[PDB]
From a paper:
[name] functions as a Zn2+/H+ antiporter and uses proton motive force to transport Zn2+ from the cytosol to the Golgi lumen. Cryo-EM analyses show that hZnT7 exists as a dimer via tight interactions in both the cytosolic and transmembrane (TM) domains of two protomers, each of which contains a single Zn2+-binding site in its TM domain. hZnT7 undergoes a TM-helix rearrangement to create a negatively charged cytosolic cavity for Zn2+ entry in the inward-facing conformation and widens the luminal cavity for Zn2+ release in the outward-facing conformation. An exceptionally long cytosolic histidine-rich loop characteristic of hZnT7 binds two Zn2+ ions, seemingly facilitating Zn2+ recruitment to the TM metal transport pathway. A monoclonal antibody Fab fragment that specifically and tightly binds to native-state hZnT7 was prepared, and the structures of the hZnT7-Fab complex were determined by single-particle cryo-EM analysis.
To explore the structural and functional roles of the His-loop, its major portion (residues His176 to Pro221) was deleted, and the resultant mutant protein (hZnT7ΔHis-loop) was used for structural and functional analyses. Cryo-EM structures of the hZnT7ΔHis-loop-Fab complex in Zn2+-bound and -unbound states were determined at nominal resolutions of 3.4 Å. Since the major class (Class 4; 67.4%; 127,941 particles) showed unusually bent TM helices and a poor density map, the second major-class density map (32.6%; 69,877 particles) was used for the model building of hZnT7ΔHis-loop. Similarly, the CTD of hZnT7ΔHis-loop is almost superimposable to that of hZnT7 WT, with an RMSD for all Cα atoms in this domain of 0.3 Å. The structure of the CTD is almost insensitive to Zn2+, displaying an RMSD for all Cα atoms in this domain of 0.3 Å between the Zn2+-unbound and -bound states. Collectively, while the His-loop may possibly contribute to the stabilization of the IF conformation via its incorporation into the widened cytosolic cavity seen in the IF protomer of the Zn2+ state 1, it does not appreciably determine the structure of the OF protomer.
Author numbering:
A (entry chain A), D (entry chain B): 22 to 162, 228 to 260, 264 to 376
B (entry chain E), F (entry chain F): 1 to 218
C (entry chain C), E (entry chain D): 1 to 215
The structure:
């Protein structure tokens, strides 16, 4: 039980995720305590949304921790795809948070607020500070690439929401501003999250690695030129992690073809293309 | 009992093509690959090409524009064709089957010597060689035959249709005035000669000439 | 392309000593722990015979005295114990990269006790004389080592214009050598002179062997 | 463009999904039209939630349609994992809908309602009728298994929400009832959705097929008993669809082992275990 | 287990006609289009010789007259043209399922022109008599077909108690047969009687060949 | 030049073990598998076991509790050991190398005949056989030797150390009173006999007995 905390603190990314998760949960709890007295209609909703984004960050942290585990004869490739699952979950979280922001903006535009306003803006500035700190901490530029990108996009979406509420507060002092700003924030969040979901779905759909896809015809041509190789059939290349490709091949060779040399040459050819793990089945054709 | 026999022209003009047929026995071409390798004094052994069971051919990078290898599974014949022969293409062309599941050539055929020149085929002139003086009767006498003025290089010299194999020393040919000269030597016990007949068999496959010479003492 | 270099170019070993032939590749011929180097044996006037495939496996039917070793680039062919039948030329072939290449052969010479050449001389036959030419042939058989000189004297005069020499490869039975010296002359040139002598200067004896005929 | 509609109508499951999607979107639009006049605070939120569940059903329908497409040298295994992705997305949708129901129940329990009540209950009965019709239609007991289960669980969750609001309405006439009922509905939704997410994550994590996992040691033992097989190494079995398993194997055999017989026997052994697609790489050991 | 049945059990073919041997497996021996059935040839007093492997591939060095075909369960061995050296026993082996099994052999008999047995008789030697026993041996050599009867008369009386017969397998040179008939008797029994006759009743001639010695 | 030689006891008691050594030449056991196959008149060819390059052994299901196959790569020897021999285990035990990349046995060794019985080894008694009467001088005379009263079955009969191969008809042994009787026949031209000596060589490896018999006419 205590080994989890030591492991999380040992890793840099896990430690940063734990720091941000604790900070978000504590600030959500503080907002809940400040809003339990009154103004529940907005503060309770905001606190629950913060706790929900906290759940998304916790999911990313759990995937990051689990990604370092070893094989157990059940997960033959290991838990390495936890990062891809976390990226997909973060993308869905961002889409649904954008839709929630859309709904809240529409509700505010179609309802006059009689609740306290100064407290709402003050805690929103604190949330903006939290989001800016999160952006600063997670600035980047067992494999762990998708999780960092997902959490960074999540922090960007939270920052967009915070700047939206701040700009609405500023413009109201100096009615149309709030819905337009909410729609713009939601659209920006969706457009930003699109590439992450594209990559995660490409990885999760057993698609050919996009980087490897260009060089596959050349590799097939070079394998075909090997002596004794009649044909190449049933080729399947898919992605496991970032820069980790797994490919399966079936070769049909001559009845007396040099199986060892053909196998070694095929492995070299597909290793020069970046395929770390490869399985080649050599079939000896009949005549 | 695995044999590969090459049948091709010994002499090829310096601007024509070449065609060699490799007849195989003891194995089927449906599951074996036959390589083509040539050996020349100035360039060593060179790998020309290979044809596989289904008919796929792989050629050397320097001969891909000239080679053409075919098959005939029913007749168990492999055809080797090369175009634009030049003076540097003279060599001994071997056809050898590929070792099963390896890149080596376990069984080779005694290839046909090919020369590329504008000279014309000349039948050999065989001459007997007998000791001048009836001396040195140490019970081992030396006999020989002089094959002078023939073209191209390949020629076969045998004694008594190959029965007298022991003591035969066939010497490599020497090129002089665009013609080859070859000599052979045999040592036979003095009890048998001249009591027993001695025959010199010379065969020139290029000119289809077979000369049988009998050694007459003086 | 892979360039295979064999050292030494010519090797001389005794009848039962240790023989080693080395073949070095320009680049590695290894893959998944398999070295694709093959060794061949070519005797005098015969197609090459496969000895070792994949540099460590004996071909079925070859004598057990042949051994192979090495990996990556350096390879070694070991012949022990040597026999008189091992006097041949050995080649190394790589099948790792197209095209297949053969290294320069390593000639193997079997050392033995020195022997005296059996010098014999033969005057031109009647057919030679009627054909318009004349050829005097001197045979040197079963002599070791290969180095030998032939001296031609014509009526006590030295001539070297028409002397041609041809050596045979080392025999596989007694590990000896044979040599022919042919003197080609015209009919009138042969008829003018009377005495012809053939000499074989060899290391075994300081006195050359002289065989002559007076015609 | 028109080919999509013909294809959707051709398939039974796609036709049913399109029917339910159109019905849900039309009823959400009707509720929006009825609530545009007044009572926005609850009716607008309910209509947007219905449109959001409509988006989830549309995602399931799109996955079902795409699952029938052919290979294009990019998706080597095809788009067959769209059903698994749809199941995972439906599971996440159910979890987040349960959290939204939790938040709405807490808000109702911590805020006295002055809005119209008769209209809210009447449209909720209509939604309950819609959910019951959906349960009746999708009663079951290119592969398409995960999508049906996901949409069925979604309809079950919507039915649970409808019965919760109806029971709260009944009990209020005859304050504590609403939050307790909301919590119970959310807990039931999460517990119901747990197995679907478990299966979808197991499929998406490249885990060994749970049905095949029991028989794998026996297959390994039977392959080891083959003549000439020194060892079996680097075995990876994963799941592509329902009852579609892909496995990769590497065998180390004798230098002169019968590669053809060993390959055929291994393929037969793993085909008798249900592995439809298998790749076996045979390595000839050195001594 | 796989039970291989070969039909016919015994096959008789002429010197140049068509010969067919069929071997049927209890269950299929196919996998991925490969039929794991192998054919062997076993002559008289020799280890089996591999002819066909995987039911369609000729072993390196066997004559081209042998052919193989069939798949799944039914397989066929074809010998054409037959020769006198093909008189042997042929087995089929399957390597598809452990353990490897061999079918019952199919004896091949080469038909030819009928021949008369070369009947010879040999009286017991002096060593036999001094040892306390007596054995009369009658040799029948180079006769076709295999069916033949031997009649033993002792001083005009028929005896069959001590007659033992041994046949040889068909010869690979002339496709003939040989037979020995041995009559074992005690010293006193042999000495009491004088005339011994050996007869070879064969299809070629209605009159049996009689070889006799009077001692 | 591939040979496999078996060396084992011809006679084994019906309650003891069996040990056969298969010495191989022309190939290395480091990359070939040697099978063990026995042939008996009543059960045909049976596959006993096989040992692979790394030492892995596969045994027949009915012999797994009794077989034990070992290797010696340096000495190129394969050891076959079987326990609890019975009367039904008499057969001809062959060791044959496995065909490369196939399940067949291309090269077989001339196995050692094994009999399982309580009888004791008895040296052969060789007796000459000569024509009784000096008649039938048709230039082809028949000679033979009678090998009577020996055990076990294997015995070798050769004429003039195998030089006179033509005309030899060795007959299969017959079992009588728990002892074997074997006869041989040779036909030689009447010009050579009795002018040229005729020798009957009989060898019994089990009893280490070699008898040379000369045919004396009467």
């Amino acid at each position: 039980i205590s080994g989890w905390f030591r492991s999380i603190l040992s890793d840099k990314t896990s430690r940063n995720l734990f720091f941000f998760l604790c900070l978000n949960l504590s600030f959500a709890f503080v907002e809940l305590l400040y809003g339990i007295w009154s103004n529940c209609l907005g503060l309770i909703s905001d606190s629950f949304h913060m706790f929900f984004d906290s759940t998304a960050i916790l999911a990313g942290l759990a995937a990051s921790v689990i990604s370092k585990w070893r094989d157990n004869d059940a997960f033959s490739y290991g838990y390495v795809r936890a990062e891809v699952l976390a990226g997909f979950v973060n993308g869905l979280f961002l889409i649904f948070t954008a839709f929630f922001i859309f709904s809240e903006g529409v509700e505010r535009a179609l309802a006059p607020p009689d609740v306290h306003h100064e407290r709402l803006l003050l805690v929103s500035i604190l949330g903006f500070v939290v989001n800016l700190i999160g952006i600063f901490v997670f600035k980047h530029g067992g494999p762990s690439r998708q999780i960092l990108q997902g959490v960074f996009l999540h922090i960007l979406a939270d920052t967009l929401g915070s700047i939206g509420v701040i700009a609405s507060a500023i413009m109201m002092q100096n009615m149309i501003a709030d819905p337009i700003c909410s729609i713009l924030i939601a659209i920006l969040i969706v457009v930003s999250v699109i590439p992450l979901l594209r990559e995660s779905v490409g990885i999760l759909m057993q698609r050919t690695p996009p980087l490897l896809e260009n060089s596959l015809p050349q590799c097939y041509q070079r394998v075909q030129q090997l002596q004794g190789v009649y044909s190449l059939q049933e080729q399947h290349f898919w992605t496991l992690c970032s820069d980790v490709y797994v490919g399966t091949l079936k070769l049909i060779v001559a009845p007396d073809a040099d199986a060892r040399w053909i196998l070694s040459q095929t492995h070299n050819i597909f290793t020069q293309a970046g395929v770390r793990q490869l399985y080649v089945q050599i079939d000896f054709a009949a005549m | 009992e695995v044999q590969l026999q090459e049948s091709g022209p010994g002499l090829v003009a310096p601007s024509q093509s070449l065609s060699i047929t490799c007849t195989v026995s003891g194995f089927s071409l449906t599951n074996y690959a036959v390589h083509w390798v040539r050996q020349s004094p100035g360039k060593g052994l060179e790998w020309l090409g290979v044809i596989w069971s289904n008919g796929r051919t792989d050629y050397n990078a320097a001969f891909i524009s000239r080679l053409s290898i075919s098959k005939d599974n029913s007749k168990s014949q492999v055809f080797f064709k090369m175009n634009s022969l030049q003076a540097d293409d003279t060599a001994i062309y071997y056809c050898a089957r590929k070792l099963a599941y390896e890149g080596a050539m376990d069984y080779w055929g005694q290839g046909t010597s090919v020369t590329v020149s504008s000279a014309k085929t000349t039948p050999p002139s065989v001459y007997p060689l007998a000791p001048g003086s009836a001396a040195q009767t140490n019970s081992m006498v030396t006999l020989g035959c002089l094959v002078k003025g023939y073209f191209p290089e390949p020629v076969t010299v045998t004694w008594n249709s190959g029965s007298l194999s022991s003591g035969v020393h066939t010497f490599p040919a020497v090129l002089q005035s665009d013609l080859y000269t070859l000599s052979s030597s045999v040592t036979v016990p003095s009890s048998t000669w001249p009591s027993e007949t001695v025959t010199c068999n010379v065969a020139h496959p290029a000119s289809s000439t077979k000369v049988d010479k009998k050694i007459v003492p003086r | 392309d892979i360039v295979l270099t064999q050292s030494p170019a010519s090797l001389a070993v005794s009848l039962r000593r240790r023989a080693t032939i080395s073949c070095r590749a320009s680049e590695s011929v290894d893959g998944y722990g398999h070295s694709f180097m093959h060794w061949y044996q070519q005797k005098s006037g015969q197609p090459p015979k496969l000895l070792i495939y994949r540099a460590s496996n004996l071909e079925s039917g070859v004598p057990a005295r042949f051994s192979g070793s090495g990996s990556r680039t350096d390879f070694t062919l070991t012949i022990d114990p040597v026999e008189a039948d091992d006097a041949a030329t050995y080649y190394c072939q790589q099948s790792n990269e197209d095209p297949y290449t053969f290294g320069s052969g390593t000639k193997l010479e079997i050392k033995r006790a020195d022997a005296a050449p059996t010098v014999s001389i033969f005057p031109p036959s009647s057919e030679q004389l009627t054909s318009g030419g004349a050829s005097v042939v001197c045979f040197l058989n079963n002599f070791y080592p290969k180095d030998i000189n032939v001296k031609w004297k014509i009526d006590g005069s030295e001539r070297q214009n028409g002397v041609l020499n041809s050596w045979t490869d080392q025999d596989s039975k007694d590990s000896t050598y044979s040599m022919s010296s042919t003197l080609t002359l015209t009919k009138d040139e042969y008829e003018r002179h009377n005495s012809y002598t053939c000499e074989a200067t060899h290391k075994t004896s300081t006195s050359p062997i002289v065989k002559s005929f007076n015609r």
